[PDB]
Design a protein around this ligand. Structure first.
Ligand SMILES: Nc1ncnc2c1ncn2[C@@H]1O[C@H](COP(=O)(O)OP(=O)(O)O)[C@@H](O)[C@H]1O
Ligand SMILES: [Mg+2]
Lengths: 208, 308, 220, 217, 220
RNA sequence: UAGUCGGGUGAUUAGCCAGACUCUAACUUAUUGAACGUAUU
């Protein structure tokens, strides 16, 4: 459409991708350049033109938190406090959100993880549901990727829905562009206290 | 009584109005409109006969609307909304979730009952007809779920009315602490020159919403945004610049200049030309100074040729 | 098997404890406190007596049931006698001792109890003033709770003749005592452990200077 | 160093740890756990960034709970610097209980719960004090709200009490101050920091009193 | 597997193709398909089913198309629920069927008697000869036992217990309620067995014995 | 420093130039309906 053409020529990644999908060269190259372009700084380190990071997190009636907002740094954020302040809860919330990107990079319409109906809703919340809202950034052509994971308490008649389509839409771009021409892909990883395990050399995985 | 009034306005029989209204909640066409990025919005428009009835109803019955309500108001718009906040340095935006589809017959009648300003009085017999006029039935099999649809001509008026008491209370509260407040449909805007007063507003909103609507209307917490002169400030698509003036924004202005340059060299197609003309009319409304500058930059003759 | 005294030696030197065994044992203790065995014996004695009267009245069909109930009664008496014969702390007292130990040693925990919710026994705790399930505790709180709970269970089982069973003898090894603990807790942990278990020889490893600030150089 | 040996007849990964060649199974738990983290992360980045000259300069988000887990203080002083140098474009989101770790990080990166929160706080904020390059004792007190000395030990209060006694007796070493001084000396020793501080207090108070007498004359 | 799953349970899932082992290694399209067409009389000449799987990271998912199988299996399930009908047998016998026989046969929990135990492990490859032996012994015990004698005995016991409660012994009311429940359960099972229109255990035994002797030449 | 605002230039959604701003802190949105601007009459 003419509207998408204008936005795409203005540098909007989603519009460029939509035009690519409907006409299936120029638009493909736009999408691929958006992902792959970058430069080597004065220190000799490669820097992508379009960075990807979590900007903001909001927790509503999640575990200990009635309503909590966190603004994150693009490079390093350190959370401190006494035991039981919810430091681990915050990382768990983020990891579940990231699972939706990973699922959709692997498989079209893949399903990420969910909030627990048994444990994750705040015990004394009057409304018996919880929300984890995240906003991600991917360069100036995609300044906001909002995701919400939601869950209602066990045995509540009214069920609260998650909103994950933006995650899926971005992950689709990575998956489809990669299929045509190889690109670099984002790494998502969680290392919790479970990383302290006994080592066994002998037990070998036959699942892929 | 509502029937008799409508019949008179529409020059139809009481019987034919009444017969039409029996299945009026199902007389909606549903279609999709593309979003500006990826995806679609779902819209439900009433059938022509129903639209006529809805318009007649709104004509016959004046419902109160607060002055802070900027949307769907005669002689007001996005310019007036943005202008209300242009002099303040700190800005807060809040958004209501599923605003139109959250408004049910129950909410409507509660608001009628509660209303302070002079509400029309309806006979109990008329209540059922009014529900059939104003509310859409999305699910054929579930006769019990009636909701306002954005696409109906009556929905703006009803929604503004339902927010009347809300607007009264919050406006009064904000005025005591020197906060400017306006509402454009589901979009709430707060601005102030005093640091840190805006931080309390979101909590105040949640309490008030619960008080007035229970769990039916809720704040969208992901869409609650603080801003200042340190950052970009916009109100309903209009940029407020650091000189406290309304602006289209630098990027939009640069795009318009691009189009004009293309026109100067006879490169614009008719579709793009028509688009340019429309955008210049809007620009003239929001930022007349921009048009003056374009006239200076591009020759009055060129611009007149374009707009003629 | 969790009620057997020498279950206290089960997997003692395996490195993890058996916190699951604690939970099972603790729920068991609760059920027995709410339902005493002698009333069951008295009730069973009454049922046996009623059934014996029916058999004496000519109803030979209930003789099989009488024999079964007599067996159940004998078993109940034997268990009671074995419990009596083991000279053991009452189940109520055992429960109380362990609860006190946990609440004294674990700073965030003020109370621990068993609820019957729906149709299942659940251990609940008051953690930082809020009632939660064990699964809702932080990893640091749970790990430390697990250590103390397990140790207390074993001490109660192995020291039935002491007024305070936690004043028994033993040798306890703890690797990385500061594991998952905030500095504030590190300042209290050794003091609390030594107060609760005064006659245990503790051999511990640490990387924490805050822990060392609470210990004499002779112990290092 | 890290390498694979096959010559025994089974595939073994070996490492040079502190100058000694050992198997992975011979590593301490602290070393193994940290090795595991870095190895896993590096593997994934290499696999996902085939077009970069340095694949570890790829994009991503990595979450690490309790970064100081099993690390000696010496290692805690290097861990964040090493990670950021090896993975320069990753967003790291970290939790810690370690003042030593915090001494290597700028205050802007730190998000800190209010001490008496109870889960109704709306926004997390940075500490008031700059942590990067600061003394650990200060971080403990100013940022983590933990006293420099353990409050549940009597000896932790002696120097404070000694100072108060000096101030109460117009700066002169009375019978009570002398007893406590001797206790401090006996317990902490002759070249202890505590005793030196006590000595310092005596000297400064004597000099202050001499000034006061000169002023009175 | 998809028919079996849906006969047993509404919305039951059969087995899926593996991404690792089932997809051809040099497949240009990077997906695999197993397409089957079934016939069920002239009214349903074609029941197509497709099992599909795509490789990880492909631009498009390839999903299985199983609705016709589920629809047909739903007919069998729903009609059977209202009025008992005959159901299809599905079985796989691999080379795994050659395996040693454990003599040490398990006690009758009562799962082997349930009609839909016929679908248990039916496509596993080995059969369940152990389940046969248990079921066959069960059939024998029931044949040698009288039918509803337990009910008659239970009826007699409930009548005797009712007389005792009517005679003023209120202590045995709890036992009466338990026995009435047992009686009702026995009658219901009998009625369900009666309602399920199933062959007598004697007849079932005979059929199987004849089958074995007819097919297996060395066994008379 | 960074981000932001945007007067100018620039076959012009880019780039470059000039000036400014900084409550922990914008993420530019939706039609055929409603309102507003323009055109038509
Ligand atoms: N559903 C819940 N409702 C209320 N409080 C909860 C719930 N789940 C966990 N908690 C509380 O939250 C804390 C969990 O801490 P955690 O997230 O592990 O943080 P940290 O790792 O900093 O200790 C505990 O204090 C626990 O009681
Ligand atoms: Mg229009």
């Amino acid at each position: 459409t003419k509207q998408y053409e204008r936005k795409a020529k203005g540098g909007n990644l989603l519009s460029a991708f939509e035009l690519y999908q409907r006409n299936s060269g120029e638009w493909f190259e736009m999408c691929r350049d958006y992902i792959q372009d970058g430069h080597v700084d004065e220190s000799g380190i490669f820097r992508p033109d379009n960075a990807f990071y979590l900007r903001r997190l909001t927790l509503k009636d999640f575990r200990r938190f009635s309503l909590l907002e966190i603004k994150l740094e693009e490079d390093l954020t350190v959370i401190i406090g006494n035991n039981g302040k919810g430091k681990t809860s915050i990382l768990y919330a983020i990891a579940k959100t990231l699972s939706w990107f990973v699922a959709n990079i692997l498989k079209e319409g893949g399903s990420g993880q969910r909030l627990s109906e048994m444990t994750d809703i705040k015990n004394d919340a009057e409304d018996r549901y919880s929300d984890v809202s995240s906003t991600f950034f991917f360069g100036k052509g995609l300044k906001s990727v909002p995701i919400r994971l939601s869950r209602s308490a066990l045995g509540t008649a009214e069920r609260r829905d998650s909103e994950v389509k933006p995650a899926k839409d971005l992950a689709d771009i990575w998956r489809v562009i990669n299929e045509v021409n190889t690109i670099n892909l984002p790494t998502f990883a969680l290392y919790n206290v479970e990383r302290s395990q006994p080592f066994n050399r002998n037990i070998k995985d036959n699942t892929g | 009584s509502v029937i008799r009034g409508l019949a008179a306005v529409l020059r139809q029989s009481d019987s034919d109005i009444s017969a039409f209204l029996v299945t009026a909640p199902r007389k909606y066409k549903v279609y999709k409109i593309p979003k500006r990025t990826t995806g679609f919005r779902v819209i439900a428009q009433p059938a022509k006969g129903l639209k006529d009835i809805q318009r007649a109803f709104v004509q016959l019955y004046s419902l109160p609307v607060h002055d802070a309500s900027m949307a769907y108001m005669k002689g007001k718009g996005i310019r007036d909304n943005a202008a209300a906040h242009a002099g303040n340095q700190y800005l807060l935006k809040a958004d209501l979730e599923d605003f139109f589809n959250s408004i049910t017959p129950a909410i409507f009648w509660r608001c009628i009952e509660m209303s302070s300003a002079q509400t029309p009085q309806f006979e109990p017999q008329d209540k059922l007809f009014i529900e059939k006029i104003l509310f859409w039935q999305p699910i054929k099999r579930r006769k019990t779920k009636l909701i306002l649809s954005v696409g109906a001509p009556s929905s703006p008026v009803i929604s503004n009315f339902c927010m009347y008491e809300f607007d009264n209370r919050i406006h009064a509260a904000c005025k005591k602490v020197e906060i400017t407040y306006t509402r454009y449909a589901d979009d709430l805007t707060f601005s102030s020159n005093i640091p840190d007063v805006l931080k309390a507003v979101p909590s105040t909103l949640e309490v008030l919403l619960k008080d007035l609507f229970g769990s039916a209307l809720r704040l969208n917490h992901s869409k609650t945004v603080f801003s200042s002169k340190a950052h970009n400030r916009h109100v309903t698509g209009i940029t407020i610049n650091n000189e406290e003036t309304l602006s289209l924004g630098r990027d939009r202005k640069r795009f318009i200049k691009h189009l004009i340059n293309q026109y100067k060299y006879g490169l614009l197609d008719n579709e793009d030309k028509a688009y340019l003309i429309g955008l210049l009319a809007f620009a003239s409304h929001i930022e007349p100074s921009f048009i003056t500058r374009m006239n200076e930059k591009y020759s009055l003759e060129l611009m007149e040729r374009l707009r003629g | 098997r969790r009620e057997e005294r020498f279950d206290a030696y089960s997997q003692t030197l395996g490195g993890a404890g058996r916190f699951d065994h604690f939970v099972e044992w603790y729920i068991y203790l609760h059920k027995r406190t709410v339902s005493d065995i002698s009333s069951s014996i008295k009730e069973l004695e009454q049922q046996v007596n009623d059934l014996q009267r029916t058999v004496d009245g000519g109803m030979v069909s209930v003789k099989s049931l009488l024999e079964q109930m007599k067996f159940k009664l004998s078993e109940a008496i034997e268990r009671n006698d074995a419990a009596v014969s083991s000279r053991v702390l009452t189940e109520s007292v055992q429960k109380s001792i362990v609860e006190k130990a946990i609440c004294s040693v674990v700073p965030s925990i003020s109370n621990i109890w068993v609820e019957m919710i729906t149709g299942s026994d659940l251990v609940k705790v008051t953690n930082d003033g809020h009632d939660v399930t064990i699964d809702q505790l932080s990893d640091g709180q749970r790990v430390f709770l697990s250590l103390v709970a397990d140790l207390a269970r074993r001490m109660v089982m192995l020291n039935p003749l002491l007024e305070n069973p936690l004043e028994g003898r033993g040798i306890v090894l703890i690797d990385e005592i500061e594991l998952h603990l905030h500095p504030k807790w590190q300042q209290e942990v050794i003091l609390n452990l030594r107060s609760a278990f005064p006659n245990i020889q503790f051999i511990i490893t640490t990387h924490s200077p805050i822990v060392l600030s609470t210990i004499e150089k002779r112990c290092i | 160093n890290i390498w694979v040996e096959m010559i025994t007849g089974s595939d073994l990964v070996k490492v040079t740890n502190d100058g000694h060649d050992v198997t992975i199974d011979q590593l301490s738990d602290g070393q193994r756990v940290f090795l595991s983290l870095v190895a896993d992360l590096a593997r994934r980045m290499v696999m996902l960034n085939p077009l970069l000259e340095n694949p570890l300069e790829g994009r991503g988000i990595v979450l690490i709970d309790e970064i100081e887990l099993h690390l000696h203080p010496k290692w805690q002083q290097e861990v964040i610097l090493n990670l950021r140098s090896a993975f320069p474009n990753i967003q790291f989101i970290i939790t810690t209980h370690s003042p030593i770790v915090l001494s290597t990080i700028e205050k802007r990166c730190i998000r800190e719960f209010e001490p008496n929160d109870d889960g109704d706080q709306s926004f997390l904020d940075s500490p008031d004090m700059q942590t990067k390059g600061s003394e650990n004792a200060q971080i403990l007190e100013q940022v983590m709200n933990v006293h420099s000395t353990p409050p549940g030990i009597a000896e932790s209060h002696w120097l404070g009490n000694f100072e108060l006694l000096l101030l109460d007796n117009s700066g002169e070493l009375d019978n009570h101050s002398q007893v406590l001084y001797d206790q401090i000396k006996a317990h902490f020793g002759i070249d202890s920091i505590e005793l030196k501080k006590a000595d310092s207090l005596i000297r400064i108070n004597k000099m202050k009193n001499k000034l006061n007498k000169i002023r009175a004359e | 597997s998809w028919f079996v799953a849906n006969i047993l349970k509404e919305g039951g899932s059969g087995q899926r193709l593996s991404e690792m082992t089932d997809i051809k290694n040099d497949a240009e399209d990077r997906y695999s398909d197993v397409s089957s067409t079934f016939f069920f009389g002239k009214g349903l000449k074609s029941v197509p089913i497709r099992l599909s799987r795509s490789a990880l990271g492909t631009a498009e998912r390839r999903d299985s198309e199983v609705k016709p199988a589920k629809d047909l299996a739903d007919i069998w399930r729903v009609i059977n629920e209202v009025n008992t009908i005959n159901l299809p047998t599905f079985a796989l016998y691999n080379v795994e069927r050659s395996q040693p026989f454990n003599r040490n046969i398990k006690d009758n929990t009562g799962r082997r008697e349930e009609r839909f135990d016929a679908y248990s492990q039916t496509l596993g490859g080995a059969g369940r000869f152990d389940h046969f032996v248990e079921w066959y012994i069960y059939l024998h015990k029931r044949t040698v036992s009288d039918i509803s004698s337990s009910i008659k005995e239970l009826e007699q016991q409930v009548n005797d217990l009712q007389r005792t409660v009517d005679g003023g012994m209120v202590s045995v009311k709890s036992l009466l309620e338990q026995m009435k429940f047992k009686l009702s359960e026995a009658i219901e099972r009998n009625d369900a067995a009666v309602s399920s229109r199933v062959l007598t255990e004697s007849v079932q035994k005979s059929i199987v014995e004849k089958a074995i002797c007819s097919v297996v030449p060395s066994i008379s």
